């Protein structure tokens with residue numbers, strides 16, 4: 001996990017090889033590319049309750065909102081399964097209004 | 110690791126707190142105190158040096 005110890009980037013594995021009087025390591029590394037720019041937000045408060053993401057980040061393509069992981073872009077809809085609530089949106093800075101979907105009401109009806 | 114990807118400082122500090130165990134809610138609820146403490150410490154190191 002130590003950065004730049006072996007390889008340049010995120011380390012996956014290595015293969016050793018011999019030499020006349022030494023060793024040669026072949027490191028396999030993972031490098032991101034093809035980036036995109038998005039608009040973010042710290043937390044979203046619905047019905048006076050502020051929700052934060054568990055593992056990920058809020059993104060917006062201009063009209064809607066999604067939760068995506070940091071190292072890749074695969075959007076998901078915002079539910080109550082991948083977000084947790086703490087307090088109310090009075091003191092946190094950058095809060096944006098939105099709605100949070102839940103499955104219980106659609107499934108019960 | 111790769112290219113340079115911009116990120117707001119507050120969310121970077123949230124990630125850094127999340128790395129050491131403390132949840133990211135604590136920073137967002139205690140931003141002003143953290144900023145004041147950091148400013149005071151960086152002022153103190155000036156006189157210390």
Ligand SMILES: *[C@@H]1O[C@H](CO)[C@@H](O[C@@H]2O[C@H](CO)[C@@H](O)[C@H](O)[C@H]2NC(C)=O)[C@H](O)[C@H]1NC(C)=O
Nearest residue numbers: 059060061062063064065066074075076077078
């Ligand atoms: C932002 O993303 C949303 C969701 O991917 C887009 O909304 C969809 O737009 C397509 C385009 O016709 C529709 O067919 C879908 O029904 C829409 N889905 C939802 C849930 O709204 C939205 O268009 C994107 N914004 C921009 C500016 O492209």
Ligand SMILES: *[C@@H]1O[C@H](CO)[C@@H](O[C@@H]2O[C@H](CO)[C@@H](O)[C@H](O)[C@H]2NC(C)=O)[C@H](O)[C@H]1NC(C)=O
Nearest residue numbers: 041044045046047048089094095096097098099
């Ligand atoms: C999110 O919604 C709340 C409540 O609807 C908004 O709070 C109101 O904002 C208006 C606009 O300035 C004020 O006149 C009211 O006094 C506020 N409180 C209430 C109880 O209505 C809040 O502004 C919204 N935030 C965003 C970013 O849209």
Ligand SMILES: *[C@@H]1O[C@H](CO)[C@@H](O)[C@H](O)[C@H]1NC(C)=O
Nearest residue numbers: 034035036037038039114115
């Ligand atoms: C996203 O938009 C900003 C605003 O101009 C721009 O600076 C940035 O370069 C864009 N992202 C990419 C990957 O070009």
